[PDB]
Amino acid sequence: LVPEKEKDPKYWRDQAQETLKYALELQKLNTNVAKNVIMFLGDGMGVSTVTAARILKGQLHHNPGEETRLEMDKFPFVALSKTYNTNAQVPDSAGTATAYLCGVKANEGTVGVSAATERSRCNTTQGNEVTSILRWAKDAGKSVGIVTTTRVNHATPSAAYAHSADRDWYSDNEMPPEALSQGCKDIAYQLMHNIRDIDVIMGGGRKYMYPKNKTDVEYESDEKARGTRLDGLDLVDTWKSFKPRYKHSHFIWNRTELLTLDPHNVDYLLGLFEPGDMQYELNRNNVTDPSLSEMVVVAIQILRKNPKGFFLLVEGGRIDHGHHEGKAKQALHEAVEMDRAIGQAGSLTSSEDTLTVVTADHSHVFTFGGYTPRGNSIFGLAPMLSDTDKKPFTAILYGNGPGYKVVGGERENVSMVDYAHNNYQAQSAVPLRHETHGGEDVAVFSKGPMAHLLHGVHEQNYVPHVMAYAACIGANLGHCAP
Amino acid sequence: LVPEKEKDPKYWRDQAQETLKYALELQKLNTNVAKNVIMFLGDGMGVSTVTAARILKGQLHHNPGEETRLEMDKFPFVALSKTYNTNAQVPDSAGTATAYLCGVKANEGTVGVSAATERSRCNTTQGNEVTSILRWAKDAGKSVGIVTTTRVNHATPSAAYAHSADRDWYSDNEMPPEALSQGCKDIAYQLMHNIRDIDVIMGGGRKYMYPKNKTDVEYESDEKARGTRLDGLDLVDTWKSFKPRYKHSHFIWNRTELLTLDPHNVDYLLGLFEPGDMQYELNRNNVTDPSLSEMVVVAIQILRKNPKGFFLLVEGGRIDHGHHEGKAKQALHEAVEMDRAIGQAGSLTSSEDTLTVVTADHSHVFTFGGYTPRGNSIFGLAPMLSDTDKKPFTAILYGNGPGYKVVGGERENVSMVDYAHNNYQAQSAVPLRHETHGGEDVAVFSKGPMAHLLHGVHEQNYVPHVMAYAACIGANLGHCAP
Numbered sequence: 001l002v003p004e005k006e007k008d009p010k011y012w013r014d015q016a017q018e019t020l021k022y023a024l025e026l027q028k029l030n031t032n033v034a035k036n037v038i039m040f041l042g043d044g045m046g047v048s049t050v051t052a053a054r055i056l057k058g059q060l061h062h063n064p065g066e067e068t069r070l071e072m073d074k075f076p077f078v079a080l081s082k083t084y085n086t087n088a089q090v091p092d093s094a095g096t097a098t099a100y101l102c103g104v105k106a107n108e109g110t111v112g113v114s115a116a117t118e119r120s121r122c123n124t125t126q127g128n129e130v131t132s133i134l135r136w137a138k139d140a141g142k143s144v145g146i147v148t149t150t151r152v153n154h155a156t157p158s159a160a161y162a163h164s165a166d167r168d169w170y171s172d173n174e175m176p177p178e179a180l181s182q183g184c185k186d187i188a189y190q191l192m193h194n195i196r197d198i199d200v201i202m203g204g205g206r207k208y209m210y211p212k213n214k215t216d217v218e219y220e221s222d223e224k225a226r227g228t229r230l231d232g233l234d235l236v237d238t239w240k241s242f243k244p245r246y247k248h249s250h251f252i253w254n255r256t257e258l259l260t261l262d263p264h265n266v267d268y269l270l271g272l273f274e275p276g277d278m279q280y281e282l283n284r285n286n287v288t289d290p291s292l293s294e295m296v297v298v299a300i301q302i303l304r305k306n307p308k309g310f311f312l313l314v315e316g317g318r319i320d321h322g323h324h325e326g327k328a329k330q331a332l333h334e335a336v337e338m339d340r341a342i343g344q345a346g347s348l349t350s351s352e353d354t355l356t357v358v359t360a361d362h363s364h365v366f367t368f369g370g371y372t373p374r375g376n377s378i379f380g381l382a383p384m385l386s387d388t389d390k391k392p393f394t395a396i397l398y399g400n401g402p403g404y405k406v407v408g409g410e411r412e413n414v415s416m417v418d419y420a421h422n423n424y425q426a427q428s429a430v431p432l433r434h435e436t437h438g439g440e441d442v443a444v445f446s447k448g449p450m451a452h453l454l455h456g457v458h459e460q461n462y463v464p465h466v467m468a469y470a471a472c473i474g475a476n477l478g479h480c481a482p
Numbered sequence: 483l484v485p486e487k488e489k490d491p492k493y494w495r496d497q498a499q500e501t502l503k504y505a506l507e508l509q510k511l512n513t514n515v516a517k518n519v520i521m522f523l524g525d526g527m528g529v530s531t532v533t534a535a536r537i538l539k540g541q542l543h544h545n546p547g548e549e550t551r552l553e554m555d556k557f558p559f560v561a562l563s564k565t566y567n568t569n570a571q572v573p574d575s576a577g578t579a580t581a582y583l584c585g586v587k588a589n590e591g592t593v594g595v596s597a598a599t600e601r602s603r604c605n606t607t608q609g610n611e612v613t614s615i616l617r618w619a620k621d622a623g624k625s626v627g628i629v630t631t632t633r634v635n636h637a638t639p640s641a642a643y644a645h646s647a648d649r650d651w652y653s654d655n656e657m658p659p660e661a662l663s664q665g666c667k668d669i670a671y672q673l674m675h676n677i678r679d680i681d682v683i684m685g686g687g688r689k690y691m692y693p694k695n696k697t698d699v700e701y702e703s704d705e706k707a708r709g710t711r712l713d714g715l716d717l718v719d720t721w722k723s724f725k726p727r728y729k730h731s732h733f734i735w736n737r738t739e740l741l742t743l744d745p746h747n748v749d750y751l752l753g754l755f756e757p758g759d760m761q762y763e764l765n766r767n768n769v770t771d772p773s774l775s776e777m778v779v780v781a782i783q784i785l786r787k788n789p790k791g792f793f794l795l796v797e798g799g800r801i802d803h804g805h806h807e808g809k810a811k812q813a814l815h816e817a818v819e820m821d822r823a824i825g826q827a828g829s830l831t832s833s834e835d836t837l838t839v840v841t842a843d844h845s846h847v848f849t850f851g852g853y854t855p856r857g858n859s860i861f862g863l864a865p866m867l868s869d870t871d872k873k874p875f876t877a878i879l880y881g882n883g884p885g886y887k888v889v890g891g892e893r894e895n896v897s898m899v900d901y902a903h904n905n906y907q908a909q910s911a912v913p914l915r916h917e918t919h920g921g922e923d924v925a926v927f928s929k930g931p932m933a934h935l936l937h938g939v940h941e942q943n944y945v946p947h948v949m950a951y952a953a954c955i956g957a958n959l960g961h962c963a964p
């Protein structure tokens with residue numbers, strides 16, 4: 001390849017000098033008060049995933065790909081974060097969520113509780129509860145909201161409003177009798193009771209809010225999408241009844257009514273679009289379901305009204321599931337969609353009074369290499385054959401997972417298969433039903449007031465402490481001190 | 483595990499508040515002139531490799547490992563760098579070296595030339611030569627030196643002083659007749675002729691400096707350690723003869739006299755300790771060979787004399803070879819040794835007038851996971867069995883490489899083998915003689931004057947441009963402008 005302009009040293013030198021000039025200009029630090037705070041979380045978005053997503057996004061416009069800039073790549077400041085649970089070397093989605101939402105490290109499988117709690121033991125929930133940055137912002141008088149592509153009562157979204165010993169207790173249908181007798185409430189119940197004035201909630205998980213055995217409104221014939229609650233509670237009606245009767249509250253479940261709302265009138269919005277987890281971006285039905293960008297735009301439009309700012313949390317959660325299934329295409333497309341949502345959010349706000357942070361909870365064992373030529377398709381093959389079995393192979397691989405395939409002592413001959421298919425599983429080393437997480441560090445991109453405080457290598461729980469200080473909320477309020 | 487103190491939220495909150503206090507103090511930027519510049523390069527040191535090395539270093543002191551802090555982890559500032567060649571999507575060790583030493587991106591397999599050069603073509607090299615930061619520092623009047631554990635004429639060390647179309651031309655014994663006729667000089671020849679006043683050179687590659695068939699001084703009976711030059715040149719004598727006769731010059735090849743020199747007296751030092759590449763840290767013979775830390779200390783002691791500062795380049799090069807062989811233990815130990823050398827260097831200098839940068843050239847396909855418990859040995863097994871074949875597996879794996887082992891259609895019982903051995907090869911997905919590089923981004927750690935200029939996501943060639951500006955050398959000299 002080697003584009004023509006790239007063969008002149010002057011081109012590279014001029015680009016480097018321009019970057020240096022911008023860096024020198026960046027020494028006038030932004031020391032203003034962050035009226036607004038927005039967090040973007042990519043579930044499982046490792047550094048390798050970020051690079052692969054950048055390459056794919058570049059190639060989608062018919063460019064070589066490597067020189068493309070992601071939206072998050074334009075964030076002025078970058079840092080590294082370690083993501084180990086107090087209980088596990090390779091973290092989970094719950095302990096990390098507690099670490100980066102409440103500021104305290106906890107055990108894996110528990111949400112909103114300190115390390116003194118034991119998984120699946122009700123007692124230890126009492127006296128070991130920790131609040132989240134969302135609660136601090138709400139107590140400060142701001143507006144808060146949650147947007148995600150997974151279930152609302154999933155680990156990441158639930159780590160901001162709930163305190164539970166087990167992450168599997170989505171509703172009372174999944175709680176052992178001992179836990180119920182001891183007096184423990186499930187995550188779905190805690191969503192509508194712990195904090196009763198959450199302005200914006202959007203995502204999936206419609207089956208966990210209705211009495212058991214009730215047919216779904218979207219899939220009437222689907223027997224797996226029925227309600228699960230054993231106490232007969234209709235949680236949507238409970239959510240509606242907890243808000244003032246002189247305000248405006250809306251419940252939506254489908255794309256047509258999402259785009260018909262007037263954000264200048266709505267005050268409280270609840271949206272559940274799928275019975276469980278929302279579909280992949282490549283499998284999405286653009287007629288009935290919305291994309292992440294549209295939800296983010298609507299949420300920001302609704303939230304920006306309060307004169308005291310707002311806090312918003314956005315999660316791209318299906319990257320984790322895509323990696324778990326061993327389908328790199330789906331995960332990369334999810335990452336690209338999240339980057340587009342980040343760009344939209346950046347377009348809708350201003351950096352002189354808004355602090356924005358993008359990060360991930362953990363990593364995976366996804367790898368890509370093989371000495372590929374410039375511009376080679378991210379889902380393509382390696383230039384050479386294997387010098388041991390004389391068979392081809394792809395540039396993307398997994399340490400473990402369902403991609404393992406050895407038909408009678410011999411590996412597969414991918415030449416005879418469609419390796420660019422949407423649901424293709426790259427080969428792995430050891431066969432597992434699901435591929436596991438990774439224990440490497442993750443990257444954090446920050447832009448806005450006091451964003452320079454995230455400068456080097458930090459523990460995960462440090463992330464919410466700086467943001468609070470930027471917004472003059474929480475335990476420390478020295479920024480606004482006279 | 484879960485140490486006792488970690489079960490209290492107050493502990494984590496206090497730690498986070500202390501970190502925030504330090505960050506708030508870092509706002510008074512260091513805008514001084516960098517009298518000295520030091521670069522640490524880890525060949526193949528990816529983010530996952532850094533995390534694994536941190537865990538191993540922590541465990542070597544009988545700690546859980548995850549909470550340990552590396553020396554480079556204490557560097558105030560962190561950034562991310564992209565490492566693609568103009569010719570390849572997955573980079574090589576030569577084009578990246580040119581990018582981060584001269585400030586221009588080039589093709590893979592070529593050293594010190596722009597992208598207009600074609601690999602293995604002498605007559606395309608004239609007029610396409612690019613100088614390195616070492617040359618800029620030397621022209622500024624500073625002292626310069628190179629220290630590495632690989633051959634001195636390897637790609638990374640050679641990118642700073644040589645201009646060649648092919649990286650394989652270590653000496654005339656590896657040059658095709660057409661290249662010799664056209665007027666090509668090999669890398670080893672260029673080492674002693676391009677720049678004739680390099681103060682400190684240390685590393686391997688003793689066979690490439692002597693006439694062909696001349697027996698080595700260390701391994702007399704070793705037939706593979708004999709000289710290779712076909713022109714009869716003794717390059718050590720040439721190096722000695724190019725220096726003034728009223729100065730002091732020393733040549734050493736073995737640990738005893740490396741520690742007997744007086745740095746306050748020596749002016750020019752050349753040290754070649756192994757015929758080819760230096761041994762692994764685990765296989766090193768401490769009696770005859772030195773470690774990286776000792777060489778770094780001696781080099782800094784010699785260099786700090788010049789009243790105008792100095793520039794030093796240090797390379798831990800055997801991490802790449804360890805990963806290529808598929809032996810994670812050796813690579814992790816090499817990374818730990820490099821971190822120790824970084825600590826020694828930091829101890830020997832001051833941050834008020836010295837700018838220090840640590841980074842890598844590219845990454846690998848090394849992965850580690852498996853949901854391990856806190857404190858689990860980095861070289862240990864995963865807690866569970868494989869739910870597909872009912873056999874164990876390790877937490878460390880490779881995308882490809884020699885670790886592949888499938889006899890009779892069945893993978894290995896690792897339990898019947900020593901998986902903690904020094905030369906154990908973790909299983910991989912596709913069998914290759916050597917495992918390949920990785921195309922993910924790499925991390926950069928900076929500390930010292932103007933170190934804050936490396937803040938976000940940058941191209942690799944941007945790295946040397948900032949350093950020069952910090953030291954008031956090169957094309958841009960605006961820092962010292964009245």
Ligand SMILES: *[C@@H]1O[C@H](CO[C@@H]2O[C@@H](C)[C@@H](O)[C@@H](O)[C@@H]2O)[C@@H](O[C@@H]2O[C@H](CO)[C@@H](O[C@@H]3O[C@H](CO)[C@@H](O)[C@H](O[C@H]4O[C@H](CO)[C@@H](O)[C@H](O)[C@@H]4O)[C@@H]3O)[C@H](O)[C@H]2NC(C)=O)[C@H](O)[C@H]1NC(C)=O
Pocket residue numbers: 389390391413415416417
């Ligand atoms: C792994 O797989 C490769 C390629 O697989 C191929 O890809 C799929 C897309 C689909 O076409 C599959 O059916 C197909 O296998 C294997 O490469 C094949 O190798 C065999 C020998 O083992 C070749 O045998 C052919 O036999 C004929 C000899 O008379 C003749 O047709 C062929 O020569 C001709 O090949 C093509 C045929 O389309 C023709 O266009 C050319 O002009 C040429 O004369 C050839 O000798 C197959 O052709 C190969 N198929 C290819 C290259 O697509 C490979 O063997 C296997 N590897 C291992 C290690 O088992």
Ligand SMILES: *[C@@H]1O[C@H](CO[C@@H]2O[C@@H](C)[C@@H](O)[C@@H](O)[C@@H]2O)[C@@H](O[C@@H]2O[C@H](CO)[C@@H](O[C@@H]3O[C@H](CO)[C@@H](O)[C@H](O[C@H]4O[C@H](CO)[C@@H](O)[C@H](O)[C@@H]4O)[C@@H]3O)[C@H](O)[C@H]2NC(C)=O)[C@H](O)[C@H]1NC(C)=O
Pocket residue numbers: 871872873895897898899
């Ligand atoms: C993969 O490998 C595992 C473990 O490998 C084992 O460890 C290595 C370090 C080395 O010792 C290897 O030789 C050894 O295989 C295999 O686990 C074995 O599984 C078999 C079948 O179940 C057991 O068979 C034995 O047969 C006897 C009848 O009961 C009896 O001696 C054994 O019970 C005894 O088990 C151990 C022996 O030291 C001990 O707890 C008591 O002595 C107890 O009575 C047992 O039933 C082997 O013992 C197992 N070996 C080990 C070390 O656990 C595994 O089968 C294999 N997996 C596959 C899928 O092939």
Ligand SMILES: *[C@@H]1O[C@H](CO)[C@@H](O[C@@H]2O[C@H](CO)[C@@H](O[C@@H]3O[C@H](CO)[C@@H](O)[C@H](O)[C@@H]3O)[C@H](O)[C@H]2NC(C)=O)[C@H](O)[C@H]1NC(C)=O
Pocket residue numbers: 254255256257287288
């Ligand atoms: C997307 O969501 C909207 C809002 O729920 C859906 O519109 C709804 O459509 C149903 C079925 O036609 C309407 O029910 C009907 O309403 C009246 C009486 O109220 C009457 O026609 C029938 O007896 C029946 O009850 C419902 O009113 C209507 N809701 C609103 C707010 O207009 C829409 O169909 C959904 N679209 C897709 C493509 O899924």
Ligand SMILES: *[C@@H]1O[C@H](CO)[C@@H](O[C@@H]2O[C@H](CO)[C@@H](O[C@@H]3O[C@H](CO)[C@@H](O)[C@H](O)[C@@H]3O)[C@H](O)[C@H]2NC(C)=O)[C@H](O)[C@H]1NC(C)=O
Pocket residue numbers: 736737738739769770
């Ligand atoms: C490490 O390196 C030093 C320095 O090269 C080695 O010492 C050197 O050993 C040689 C071989 O024995 C000495 O040469 C001998 O010297 C005298 C005459 O000068 C005489 O014994 C022999 O005729 C021979 O020429 C040499 O002098 C000596 N040091 C120096 C500075 O020249 C040492 O052996 C090495 N150690 C190891 C463990 O490899």
Ligand SMILES: *[C@@H]1O[C@H](CO)[C@@H](O[C@@H]2O[C@H](CO)[C@@H](O)[C@H](O)[C@H]2NC(C)=O)[C@H](O)[C@H]1NC(C)=O
Pocket residue numbers: 123
């Ligand atoms: C949590 O409550 C449970 C009730 O299920 C307690 O479990 C019993 O506790 C007593 C006191 O130690 C033990 O003698 C019993 O053996 C326990 N039973 C079981 C099945 O574990 C549990 O101890 C309580 N935890 C605390 C901290 O008081």
Ligand SMILES: *[C@@H]1O[C@H](CO)[C@@H](O[C@@H]2O[C@H](CO)[C@@H](O)[C@H](O)[C@H]2NC(C)=O)[C@H](O)[C@H]1NC(C)=O
Pocket residue numbers: 285286287
């Ligand atoms: C909504 O999804 C539909 C169905 O997949 C898309 O229609 C496809 O569009 C692609 C891209 O142009 C075509 O290659 C397919 O042939 C179309 N399929 C059908 C059945 O018509 C549609 O483009 C999507 N709309 C948006 C706005 O993204």
Ligand SMILES: *[C@@H]1O[C@H](CO)[C@@H](O[C@@H]2O[C@H](CO)[C@@H](O)[C@H](O)[C@H]2NC(C)=O)[C@H](O)[C@H]1NC(C)=O
Pocket residue numbers: 603605606660
């Ligand atoms: C650089 O030199 C090579 C020969 O070493 C030239 O190669 C050309 O191609 C063939 C290859 O065998 C030679 O026989 C031709 O004489 C060469 N010339 C042409 C015009 O093709 C190559 O062209 C040279 N490049 C330049 C710019 O002079």
Ligand SMILES: *[C@@H]1O[C@H](CO)[C@@H](O[C@@H]2O[C@H](CO)[C@@H](O)[C@H](O)[C@H]2NC(C)=O)[C@H](O)[C@H]1NC(C)=O
Pocket residue numbers: 767768769
């Ligand atoms: C130099 O290397 C030698 C040889 O490995 C080391 O001596 C051994 O060190 C190991 C590790 O502590 C011990 O288990 C052995 O008992 C030692 N003796 C032998 C004969 O192997 C020696 O410690 C190393 N020296 C330094 C300073 O690292």
Ligand SMILES: *[C@@H]1O[C@H](CO[C@@H]2O[C@@H](C)[C@@H](O)[C@@H](O)[C@@H]2O)[C@@H](O)[C@H](O)[C@H]1NC(C)=O
Pocket residue numbers: 212213
């Ligand atoms: C839910 O219903 C299950 C099946 O019973 C019948 O069929 C389903 C499809 C519904 O129409 C249901 O109302 C019918 O009774 C039962 O096995 C299950 O016990 C029912 N659950 C409850 C809580 O009643």
Ligand SMILES: *[C@@H]1O[C@H](CO[C@@H]2O[C@@H](C)[C@@H](O)[C@@H](O)[C@@H]2O)[C@@H](O)[C@H](O)[C@H]1NC(C)=O
Pocket residue numbers: 694695696697
């Ligand atoms: C290099 O040497 C080859 C083998 O010679 C052996 O090694 C040398 C160093 C002496 O010890 C000699 O007695 C041994 O027999 C020769 O075959 C070869 O031609 C030589 N090559 C050159 C270029 O001189």
Ligand SMILES: COc1ccc(OC)c(S(=O)(=O)Nc2cnc3ccccc3c2)c1
Pocket residue numbers: 092093277321324325434
């Ligand atoms: C123990 O750590 C975790 C954490 C979260 C997690 O996902 C909830 C898993 S999982 O891989 O077992 N669940 C899966 C698996 N395959 C899926 C495929 C398609 C859609 C959704 C999926 C969900 C493991």
Ligand SMILES: COc1ccc(OC)c(S(=O)(=O)Nc2cnc3ccccc3c2)c1
Pocket residue numbers: 574575759802803804806807916
């Ligand atoms: C094409 O990209 C590169 C770049 C550098 C490189 O290393 C020079 C290699 S290599 O893997 O083929 N060389 C190797 C291989 N195994 C080794 C084992 C032990 C000691 C040294 C080794 C050296 C490939």
Ligand SMILES: [Ca+2]
Pocket residue numbers: 218253254273274288289
């Ligand atoms: Ca839907």
Ligand SMILES: [Ca+2]
Pocket residue numbers: 700735736755756770771
């Ligand atoms: Ca030696």
Ligand SMILES: [Mg+2]
Pocket residue numbers: 043093150154155156157315317320
């Ligand atoms: Mg999640």
Ligand SMILES: [Mg+2]
Pocket residue numbers: 525575632636637638639797799802
């Ligand atoms: Mg190297």
